[model samples]
Target: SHLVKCAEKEKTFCVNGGECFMVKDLSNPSRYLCKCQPGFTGARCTENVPMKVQNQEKAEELY
Candidate 1:
């Protein structure tokens, strides 16, 4: 979990499965903030790339 400050008049990106809260009267010319929601974690709320196993026999090779 991490905290990111929303720049002045700037917007933060909240990915699916993530949550954020806005703070009032924080820094001058800068307000709002963002954070990841429960069950999800990663920078920018982009959950770490998932790893999957593939069977060589069923996997197709790309040129």
Candidate 2:
């Protein structure tokens, strides 16, 4: 029910700062896929993934 229909309605089903990308074939069952961000991974981008930030400069200082 939550599946979005291609061009049928104006909606980007992708959530949690995710991006909506339409399927390759318009005839495909699933109209679109939720392109989740680095911090979110799931069908709907509902899952949370921890992101790590490491500065390249810090590594250089060691050398």
Candidate 3:
């Protein structure tokens, strides 16, 4: 219920390849959590992730 509303609000809270989640505040039981999505691993989704490079050397000519 809460998660649904979180996404609807102004903030994506988790945009692009990321999503919204809820976790246990372990230390602070009174508070809730806003977990990150797949691509939202690090701070502001700046975490280094796997990437792809089809042509690492150079680009091929069409003509």
Candidate 4:
């Protein structure tokens, strides 16, 4: 008998309101894994990859 599970007892691991998901338990028929969503990474997608910051500059006019 093969067992299957989800993040929350076969419910959903896409928590924190993200696109993350948990792949079906393969190696462990009774276990599963989490798939981090965009801008998220880690065991539970609680980590970040750090974003880049942009700054704008204005030109000075001499009249």
What are the clashing pairs of model 4?
A: none
Using lDDT as the measure, which candidate wins?
2
Give one digit per residue, the lDDT tens place, for model 4 in 1-63: 232335454444544444433444445444435544556666556666543322222422221
Clashing pairs in 2: none
Q: Which pairs, if any, clash in model 1?
A: 19-37
Q: Per-residue lDDT for 1-63 in model 2, tens only?
A: 353333524234667766666666556665666656788776677877655443554654446
Per-residue lDDT over 1-33 for candidate 1, one digit per residue giving the tens place of the 0 to 100 score: 224554434445556544554465556443335
Candidates' TM-scores?
0.34, 0.50, 0.34, 0.35
Let me know the TM-score candidate 3 reaches against the reference structure: 0.34
lDDT against the true structure, per candidate, is 0.48, 0.60, 0.43, 0.45
Ranking, TM-score, top scorer first: 2, 4, 3, 1
TM-score for candidate 4: 0.35
Top-TM-score structure, candidate number: 2
Off by over 4 Å in 4: 1-14, 18-29, 51-63
Q: lDDT tens digits, residues 23-47, model 3?
A: 4344643232345544334544546
Better of 1 and 2 by lDDT: 2
Model 1 whole-model lDDT (C-alpha atoms)? 0.48
Error of 3 at 43 (Å): 2.3
Once superposed on the true structure, which residue ranges of model 1 sit more than 4 Å away at CA?
A: 1-12, 26-35, 48-63
